[PDB]
Structure formats: C-alpha cells, structure tokens
From a paper:
The ABC transporter CydDC plays a central role in the biogenesis of membrane-integrated and soluble cytochromes. Here, we used cellular, biochemical, structural and computational methods to characterize the structure and function of the heterodimeric bacterial ABC transporter CydDC. We provide multi-level evidence that CydDC is a heme transporter required for functional maturation of cytochrome bd, a pharmaceutically relevant drug target. Each subunit is composed of a membrane domain formed by six transmembrane α-helices (TMH), an N-terminal cytoplasmic elbow helix oriented parallel to the membrane plane and a cytoplasmic NBD.
Based on the deduced sequence of binding events and the distinct interaction patterns between heme and CydDC, we reasoned that the interaction between H85C and the heme iron marks the most crucial step of substrate recognition. To test this hypothesis, we generated a CydDC H85AC mutant and performed growth-restoring complementation studies and oxygen consumption measurements. In addition, we investigated the effect of the histidine to alanine replacement on ATP hydrolysis activity. A lack of this highly conserved histidine residue abrogates the functionality of CydDC. Furthermore, CydDCH85A could not be copurified with bound heme and could not be loaded by the exogenous addition of heme. These observations were confirmed by cryo-EM structures of CydDCH85A, exclusively adopting the IFasisolatedapo conformation, irrespective of presence or absence of exogenously added heme to the samples.
Author numbering:
A (entry chain D): 4 to 588
B (entry chain C): 1 to 573
The structure:
C-alpha cells in the first residue's frame, strides 16, 4: 500500500552516485548496439558461406570485425558490472552515514529503546538490502527499454514483418502478466496470515524444546511439524502455481516469437508467404539477423524478472529506513555556558518533567535539592523513573522546568564542558575500548601511570588482574567476554575513579554482580561517593544509614525524603519498600 | 564434501519427485537449444532450396519440429519450476523433522552449551541452506552436464571433430571455470566475513556504550574507527564484484569462442562435405544457444561451499551423544510418589569446594517440601536431575522405592509434572498451549482450569482459539506463571516440582500463586525451590540450604522456635 512513496524515497536516495547510474544507462545502450552489430556480422558471414559459397579465407574482415564486437561486448559487460556496484556502494555509504548521524545525536535515550541486535539489523543488514536495487534492478530497467527498442529499430528496415512479430508481443506480455498478477494477489492475501503463522513454527518448537521434553510431547510435535510443513507446502504452492504463470507468459512469447520468425522466414524463402518484405526478395542475412536477435529481444525482460526480488527487499528495507529517518523526536538543547569551577555542584530542581525523545513524560514533578558534597539515594519500585532522573542529569533526556546545577540551568549548559565535570557508573557496564588498560584510561587518556595504578588499586581491579592471562593489557573481547559481570563492573568503577568529578551518578551498580564483587564495588564506591556530590539509584535498601538523604519515588514523583533513621521507623512507603527486600532471602 | 552424505541420503524419500525436477530442467533446456538450432537449419535449408524447391523440400516436418520445440520449451519451464519448487518443500519438511527428531534426545545438555538465542536462529538458517542444495546446486550442475553430453552426442552424428570441439569447450568451462573462480574469491570471501563481523561488533559496542562514550568524550573518536572498518569492508566488496565482473566477461568470451570456432571450422566441411551449406548454421546456432546451460553453473558452485559449511554445523550438533538413556519396560505409573534423595548435589560445586558430599532428604507421599537457598550463591540443579536432564554423577534419586534411572520416558514424564522458571509460550492457540500438558482434555476442562487458576482474562477473546505467542498476544509475568501452573494441574502427575514459582511477581499476585499451590496441589507431593519466605508456613518440613548443604530442617514453627539461620532470614538480612 506504501509502494509509491517508499519507491519515491528509494529513487530520491539515488541522487548521490547519479553519474554511476547515468554511465550504467549509457553502457546499456552501447551494449544494445554491440548486440545488433554482432548479429549483423554473423548474418552476413553466414549468408556468404551458405548462399554465395565464399570460402572462409575470403571473409577475414567480417571475422575480424565479429571478434572485435565480441571483445567490445564482453568489455561493456565487465564495465557495466563495476559501474553498477559503484552506484549501489555510494548510496549505502551515504544512507548509513546519515543513519548513524541521526542515531548518535538522538543519544542513548532513543538507542536503548530497541535491542542492539535490532539496530545492527537496521544499519548492517537492511541498508545492504538496497544494494542490488541500484546495482542491478535500476540499470536493468533501463536495459529492458533501451535494448529491445534497438532490435526493433534494427530489424524494421530489413523486414517489417519480423519486427512486427517482436513488437507485437511488447503490449501482449504486460497485459497477460497483469491478468494473472491479480489472480496471484488474492492468493497472497487469503494465505498471508497463515503463512506468517507457519513461517516461525519451526523456530518456535525449537526454542521451546525444553518444555516439550518435560511434558513428553517430543513425539507429538514431530507430527505437528509434519502437519505444519504439509500445510505450508500446499498453501504456498497455490501462490507459486500462479506466480510461475507470470514468468511463463514471457517464456511463451519468446518461444512463440522464435518459432514464428522461423516459420515466416522459412515459408517466405520457399514462396509460401509474399508479404513482409519491402518489395524485394527476402535475403538469408535478413532471416539470420531476426533469428539471432529474437532471443536477445526478450533477454532484458527475463533478466529483469530475476532482479524483481532485489526491488522487493529494497522496498522492505526502505519501509523501515524511511520511518526511522522521519520520526519526530527532539533533542536536549545545548546552550553555550561553560561551568564556573571544578568544584562539587549544587543541583536543585524546581519542577521537572523529564521527557523521552518522542515526547512521553518519564518523571513527574520533582522537587528536590542536593547541596554541594551531599550524597543522595534514589529508591523505589521498578519502572518508577529512577534511572530517568540520572539520564536527564547527564544531558541524555530533555526536560521542561528548572534543573539548575550550581545555580546555572542545565538546558543552557554546554554539554562538552558539563560532561567533563560529570563521571558516572551504570548498571550492566559497557566496555567499548580494546584492552583493559585503554578502557580505564578512556576517561582521561592523559593520566600518568602512578595515577592510573592508583585507580586500579582503589577500584579493586588489580586483585584479579593476575587471574587474567595478559594482565592489565588483556583484550576484553566482544561484550566483555573475558571478564565476568562482577569483574567488568569493577573496571567500570576504575574509570569513574580516575578523573575527579563535580558530580557522580551511580545508576544501580553492584546490582546483578556476584557476592564478592558486590562487596568490592560498593566498598570502593562508598568511600568515593563522599568526596563529591553523588546521586545513587539502588534497590539494596540496607546499610544506607551513612547516606545523607534518601529520595523514594513511585510513578516518577518524590513521595518521601529524609535520612535512613527517620524513614525506617516512620512506617511510610520506604518501610513498605524495605519490608519487601527483607522478605526475599 | 563428505559432509553432505547424511543429507543426500535424505533424498531416498521423494527420489522420483526430485529426479523429475531435474529431467524437466534438461528437457526444457534441450528444447531451447533445439528450437534455435532447428530454426537456424530450417532458414538455411529453405533459402538454399529456394522458390524452385518448394515441392522438393519437405518443410512440414521442420515446421512441426519448431512448433513442438516451442511448446515444450514454455510448458517444460513452467512444470520444471513447479516440481522443483514443490520438491524443495518436501525435503525441507524432511530436514525439519530430521533435525528436530534428533535434537530431542539431547535437548537440555548438549544443545544449551551454546547461547540458545543465537544458536537456534542459526539452526533454522542452516536447515534452509541444506534445503538449497537440490535447486541451487544439484539441479544446475547436473542439468548442465547432461545437456552438454546430449548436444555433443547429438552433433556427433553429423560431424565428430566439430561436436567434440564444441562439447569439449563446454565441458572445459563446466569443470575448470567454477572451481577456478571459487579459488580466486576464497580469500576475499573470508576477508569479507571477517570485516562484516568486525563492523558488527564495533557498531554494537558503539551503540550500546553511547552513554559511556558521550560522557568520556570518545563518541566521535570511536565513530571514526567504526567508519574506517566500513571503508575496509566496502573495499573487500569491490574485490568480490570485480571478480564477478570478470567471471561474466569471460563467459561471454568463451561463448564467443565457441561461435567463432563453429563458423570457421564448420565452413570447411562437416561429414566430408566440401560445401556444408545448411549444416553450417546448425552448428553455429547450437553453439549460440547451448551456453544457456552453463549460465547458472558458476553461482551453483559458490553456493556449494555454503551448503557444505551448513552441513557440518548441523552434523556436529545433531551427532553428539545424549546424556541420558532410558530403558524400555512400560511400567505402570503409580500415584502417591514418595521421592527419596540420597547424597545428591543441589548446586554445581564452585572452585571453593562447596559440598563434596551432597544433600539427603525424604519426601513422603503427599508432603509439601520447600527448599530455601541463598540468592546468587550458585544455581539449583535439583530439577534437572529429577527431570533426568543429566545423570547425577554423585548420589542417587529414589522415585517411590525404585531408582529414577529405571523408568521409561513415557512413565517418567507421567510421575513428574514440573513448572520451570522459564515458562515457554508456544506460538499457537490457547487450546494448544494447554493440551500440551494433557492431549485428551475436553474443551470445557481447559476453560474450567483457566477460570480456576485465575486466567479468566484469556477467555473472552475468541475463547480458547486465541493466538498466543510470536504472532499473537504476549503474556506478562504472573499472567504467564499461572499458565505454567495450569499445565501442571492439567498434567496431573503425582509429584510436582516447583522452581521459584513466585519469582519476579508482585506481592498481590504472588500471594495468589501460593494459595494455588496449597489448594489445588493438596495431595501431589510438591517439592518447591524458592528464594523467598512469603508463604513457607503452609509447607511441611522446610529445608534451608547453605553452601550446598542442609544446615536447618523442619516445620516453619519448629524451625522458628529454635534460633537458627531461618530465624535470621525471617527478621531480615
Ligand atoms: N529513554 C526512554 N525512552 C522511552 N521510554 C523510556 C525511556 N526510559 C524509560 N522509559 C520508560 O518510562 C518509564 C520510566 O522507567 P525508568 O526510568 O527506567 O524507571 P526505573 O527505576 O529505571 N526502572 P528500574 O531500573 O527497573 O528500577 C518506564 O515505563 C520505561 O519503560
Ligand atoms: Mg533503573
């Protein structure tokens, strides 16, 4: 239903590398001339030695010209394939560049909305689906209208009956393809839902093979696989029985045109058919020209049919890439005001409404104040907007209201300079660098080795380095494969403790860690949370008596605020929250 | 290549449908050559005969040959495309059954060694590639070979030195060129799969660590590093197309060589005839049309490397030895199962040597047992040993006075109904997600359980014919927990194994689950493993676990009356 405007998007993305698609259209015209020259030289050579009985040694010039047109024709086929690739490559490099540009300025707020395996599909597997639309389908659609018109133009002076046989099928092919194309469109729609259900049936019975085992349904799911495969087979054979007629319409008219050209020329040579020629005896070279060129008239149409799948999956790729590039989402504004000093900051919020990039409000009205050097705690149930406040405080989320850091509002604070005074630790630590040493030094690449070693000593990461093979320079691998979740989270602590900061945001560290790493992370992060303003989200709800204030929220609003002593005995929401933690071992 | 042998042997079934789809490809592809070689001879014979030779020349026989060759060229292609596509769905069904029927005996162990999400998405893709062997590889290669051998044999009746130079040229590029271009692009194809996965991992690390990179100022430094990998990745994609542009310019030159050779060689005579006449065109038009047979042959050989690679992955995955083996006795299932465990381990032993000797416990018939474990201290493996996922290396399980290894799978799955922590929602109807537990249940019984369990919100929309799963409606935790319990109540086994049933559930739903176990599973010998203390009062003989061993045991009141680790757990911390 969206084909017309999706294809308009596809055809507008091709303005880049327009000279590659212009050379490929011009090389398809040149290739259609070498096809005609090939058939004309063969027809004259064949006539000379069949009718005039000229020896092959007296035909050296036509043979030389025939070999030359074969070398030129193979040259443009090589040239047209390389030029066609360059067309597709430059759209893919430009679309990917502006997909990664949009996906970076949107920031982590929008990226985490979808799993990273689904972003890699968009950037790496769907952008590449558009290559064969520009490399093959678009050039072939030019070859399908350029070359066939050249054969008709080339044959017409010699014999208008032969050119009428080829031109006569030009309207009759799309007429019958559309006649059977609408009989194969209702088959798609009346089997669309069932084939969608039946496609993921095997992977579903294969993921849930644990549940089948414990219930003893393994031998009864073999029959369902059989019954679902029989149903899928015969349901999609009805679609294919009509989709193979459309391809068989073209094979019918290329078979009828070759047969009919042979009969017309064969019978006219014997005197059975007088029409067709321009009041002159039909020569043998005229018949060979029309017989060599008859299969070449329909070859561009046959090759285009093999490239239609390229257009189908390019539109499916443009289906998801057009919506992505036109989603209305607004970024946090970046005022140019550098922070005054590298001292602990006094963050205070008058009335905040932290909003996602799509406009949804994540955290309701927030009324709080964190004085310089004061460490707070955010606690609450899941989905309560605890992490949304830390992302907004980092600049990743747009807010309406007043959130002033050290007296200056966050909206008019320079993100380049504000984030130099911001260090933070998040749950599920991400290690982007290559080596463990270059990953700690990511925070401050200019760190000295004595400052670097102190960070590794303070963060309790040098006490598991000997377990690592290469030590400090151990390659972390993909998704921190080498390091355990507890060990990687301690490395994330190391680069937080490297540079002194004016504000430390700990978004639930040591949450999913093992028992020993949780003790080591918290100990190294509880003594580092009392030398600058920190803001820790946690679910531990215990040993918080040393923290200055506790902000508990549900549904994105601070409901209770105070020290641990006054909330544990107050019986309020914190006590209800604290009782849940003690309920589970 | 010996990898395809277990999968070629799958063709013995449907070996007439598969052979027909290749014969129809040869007949179609011979009619295409016959249509153009007979037309070329007919035009030459008619022109040589001339108007004066109208009556002497029998033109009706060739005119019926061109009509027949055109019908079987267009009818043959339609039927070859149908049988080939039909028969490639019949071997896909066989491949799907073959792997599934062979992955069942090693489902828990030997298949979950990998990452389940990434592995199973590759098992499905690899069976699809094994499905491509017949139509992408075997059919183009075999069809090209015997089309060459028939035109060579056929043309050898007129001339022998001409049929073999045309046949020899076509046989040389059938056997020498597809391997020659597979060797040239092998290095690039390896360098292409490395760079595609290197860009994939650098992009995921860049997207996932966008919060980290932005704050530390490396977001644009690692984007340059990411773009340089793409530039290297695109260079390796030029070289793959620069070799495809060369394999296409060479097939055009080889087919040119076989036409120029036919023109030059066949004009010197065919059967000793000084002036061949119409026989020249029969050879140059066969050579002109016979290279359509070799069109798919290079791409058929490239895909053969993928099919062989996919054949090894499926083979080495489905050829593992199953952990457990079941006897065949058909012992009658007995109600009132009295489970007995003797020196069986409860948790995978840590390098810390948690428990060299395992736990021991007796669960009499009808008893409800709850096991308390420290959160995050190892993982419970009591259910896998009880479900016979793997044989216990130490200790033994006595299921109602008899060892658990002496039960056939049919009986074992009937004495034990287990509700796992990871409850699977099959993409099927609500009836099919419940008849899984009990195949013979009536329509009312399934709805009766759903009302009784509390899944009443699942009966107003289409009743039990609601699509649950990937293509339909998802179920939330707690709404999915009560489905797992619904199956176990429908299964009706004497022994029930609960695995953290109230995990990740809010206190409103969690209190409703514990009532379900105490009410419906009143006489079903429940053995429950949890990390919570909410409803342990109703359970008999609470077992507290420390370091993989039983430190405290007894009733809730009995265990609370005496000071112990359960007392500390109840008060907090
Ligand atoms: N970047 C975002 N874009 C859109 N929706 C979001 C975003 N971040 C959070 N949400 C949603 O808005 C609500 C805020 O949740 P959230 O801020 O994550 O609370 P939370 O305390 O972090 N949950 P948890 O970490 O499990 O304790 C939830 O319903 C989220 O699904
Ligand atoms: Mg959070």
């Amino acid at each position: 239903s969206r084909q017309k405007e999706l294809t308009r998007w596809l055809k507008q993305q091709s303005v880049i590398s327009q000279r590659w698609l212009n050379i490929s259209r011009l090389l398809g015209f040149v290739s259609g001339i070498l096809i005609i020259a090939q058939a004309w030289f063969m027809a004259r050579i064949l006539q000379h030695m069949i009718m005039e009985n000229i020896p092959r040694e007296a035909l050296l010039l036509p043979f030389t010209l025939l070999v030359l047109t074969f070398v030129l024709r193979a040259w443009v086929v090589w040239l047209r394939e390389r030029v066609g690739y360059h067309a597709g490559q430059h759209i893919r490099f430009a679309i990917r560049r502006q997909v990664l540009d949009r996906l970076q300025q949107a920031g982590p707020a929008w990226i985490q909305g979808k799993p990273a395996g689904s972003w890699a599909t968009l950037v790496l597997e769907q952008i590449d689906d558009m290559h064969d639309y520009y490399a093959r389908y678009l050039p072939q659609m030019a070859l399908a209208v350029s070359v066939p018109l050249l054969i008709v133009v080339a044959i017409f002076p010699s014999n208008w009956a032969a050119a009428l046989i080829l031109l006569g099928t030009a309207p009759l092919i799309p007429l019958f393809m559309a006649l059977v194309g609408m009989g194969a469109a209702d088959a798609n729609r009346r089997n669309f839902l069932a084939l969608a259900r039946l496609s993921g049936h095997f992977l579903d019975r294969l993921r849930g093979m644990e549940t089948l085992r414990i219930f003893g349904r393994g031998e009864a799911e073999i029959e369902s696989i059989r019954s679902a495969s029989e149903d899928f087979r015969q349901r999609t054979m009805e679609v294919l029985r009509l989709a193979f007629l459309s391809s068989g319409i073209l094979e019918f008219f290329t078979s009828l045109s070759i047969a009919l050209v042979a009969v017309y020329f064969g019978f006219s040579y014997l005197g059975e058919l007088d029409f067709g020629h321009y009041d002159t005896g039909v020569t043998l070279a005229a018949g060979f020209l029309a017989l060599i060129l008859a299969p070449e008239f329909f070859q561009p149409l046959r090759d285009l049919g093999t490239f239609y799948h390229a257009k189908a999956q390019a539109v499916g790729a443009a289906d998801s890439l057009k919506t992505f590039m036109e989603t209305p989402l607004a970024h946090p504004q970046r005022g140019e005001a550098e922070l005054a000093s590298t001292d602990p900051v006094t963050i205070e919020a008058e009335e905040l409404f932290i909003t996602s990039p799509e406009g949804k409000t994540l955290a309701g009205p927030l009324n709080f104040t964190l004085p310089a050097g004061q460490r707070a705690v955010l606690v609450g149930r899941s989905g309560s907007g605890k992490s949304s406040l830390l992302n907004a405080l980092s600049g990743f989320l747009s807010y309406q209201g007043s959130l002033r850091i050290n007296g200056i509002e966050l909206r008019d604070l320079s993100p380049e300079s504000w984030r130099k005074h911001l260090s933070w630790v998040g749950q599920n630590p991400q290690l982007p660098a290559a080596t463990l040493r270059d990953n700690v030094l990511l925070a401050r690449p200019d760190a000295s080795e004595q400052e670097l070693q102190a960070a590794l000593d303070n963060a309790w990461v040098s006490e598991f380095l000997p377990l690592l093979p290469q030590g400090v320079d151990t390659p972390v691998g993909d998704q921190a494969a080498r390091l355990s979740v507890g060990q990687a989270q301690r490395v994330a602590v190391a680069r937080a403790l490297l540079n002194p900061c004016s504000l430390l945001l700990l978004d639930e560290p040591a949450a999913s860690l093992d028992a020993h790493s949780e003790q080591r992370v918290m100990e190294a992060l509880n003594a580092a949370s009392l030398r600058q303003t920190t803001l820790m989200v946690t679910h531990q709800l215990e040993d918080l008596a040393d923290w200055d204030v506790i902000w508990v929220m549900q549904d994105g609003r601070i409901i209770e605020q105070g020290r641990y002593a006054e909330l544990s005995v107050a019986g309020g929401p914190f006590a209800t929250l604290l009782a849940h933690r003690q309920e589970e071992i | 290549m010996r990898a395809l042998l277990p999968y070629l042997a799958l063709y013995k079934r449907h070996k007439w449908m598969l052979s027909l789809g290749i014969v129809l490809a040869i007949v179609t592809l011979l009619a295409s050559i016959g249509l153009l070689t007979l037309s070329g001879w007919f035009l030459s014979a008619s022109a040589v005969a001339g108007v004066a030779g109208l009556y002497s020349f029998n033109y009706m026989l060739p005119a019926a040959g061109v009509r027949g060759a055109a019908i079987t060229r267009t009818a043959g292609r339609y039927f070859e495309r149908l049988v080939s596509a039909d028969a490639t769905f019949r071997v896909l069904q066989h491949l799907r059954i073959y792997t599934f029927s062979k992955l069942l005996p090693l489902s828990p162990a030997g298949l979950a060694r990998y990452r389940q999400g990434e592995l199973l998405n590759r098992v499905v893709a690899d069976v699809d590639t094994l499905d491509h062997l017949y139509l992408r590889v075997i059919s183009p290669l075999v069809g090209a070979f015997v089309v060459i051998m028939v035109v060579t044999i056929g043309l050898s009746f007129l001339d022998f030195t001409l049929a073999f130079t045309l046949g020899g040229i076509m046989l040389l590029t059938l056997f020498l060129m597809p391997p020659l271009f597979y060797r040239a692009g092998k290095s690039t194809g390896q360098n292409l799969t490395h760079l595609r996965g290197q860009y994939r991992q650098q992009l995921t690390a860049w997207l996932q660590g966008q919060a980290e990179l932005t704050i530390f100022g490396a977001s644009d430094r690692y984007r340059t590093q990411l773009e340089n990998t793409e530039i290297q990745w695109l260079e390796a994609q030029r070289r793959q197309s620069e070799l495809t542009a060369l394999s296409q310019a060479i097939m055009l030159l080889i087919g040119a060589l076989a036409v120029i050779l036919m023109l030059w060689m066949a004009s010197g005579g065919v059967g000793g005839n000084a002036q061949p006449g119409a026989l020249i065109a029969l050879f140059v038009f066969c050579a002109l049309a016979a290279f359509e047979a070799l069109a798919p042959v290079t791409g058929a050989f490239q895909h053969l490397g993928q099919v062989i690679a996919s054949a090894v992955r499926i083979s080495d995955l489905t050829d593992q030895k199953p952990e457990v083996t079941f006897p065949d006795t058909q012992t009658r299932v007995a109600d009132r199962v009295s489970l007995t465990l003797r020196d069986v381990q409860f948790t995978y032993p840590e390098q810390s040597q948690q428990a060299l000797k395992g736990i021991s416990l007796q669960v009499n018939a009808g008893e409800h047992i709850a096991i308390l474990g420290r959160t995050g201290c190892g993982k419970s493996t009591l259910l896998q040993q009880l479900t016979r996922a793997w044989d216990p290396q130490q200790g033994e399980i006595l299921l109602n006075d008899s060892p658990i290894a002496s039960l056939n799978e049919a009986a074992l799955r009937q004495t034990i109904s287990v509700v796992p922590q990871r409850v699977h929602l099959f993409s099927a109807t609500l009836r099919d997600n419940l008849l899984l537990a009990s195949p013979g249940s009536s329509d009312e019984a399934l709805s009766e359980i759903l009302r009784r369990v509390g899944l009443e919100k699942l009966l107003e929309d289409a009743g039990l014919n609601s699509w649950l799963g990937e293509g339909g409606r998802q179920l939330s935790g707690g709404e999915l927990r009560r489905l797992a319990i619904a199956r176990a109540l429908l299964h009706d086994a004497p022994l029930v194994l609960l695995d953290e049933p109230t995990e990740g559930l809010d206190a409103t739903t969690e209190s409703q689950i514990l009532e379900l176990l105490a009410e419906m599973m009143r006489e079903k010998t429940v053995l429950m493993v949890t990390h919570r203390l909410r409803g342990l009062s109703r359970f008999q003989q609470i077992i507290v676990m420390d370091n993989g061993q039983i430190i405290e045991q007894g009733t809730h009141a009995e265990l609370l009356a005496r000071q112990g680790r359960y007392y500390q757990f109840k008060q907090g911390l």
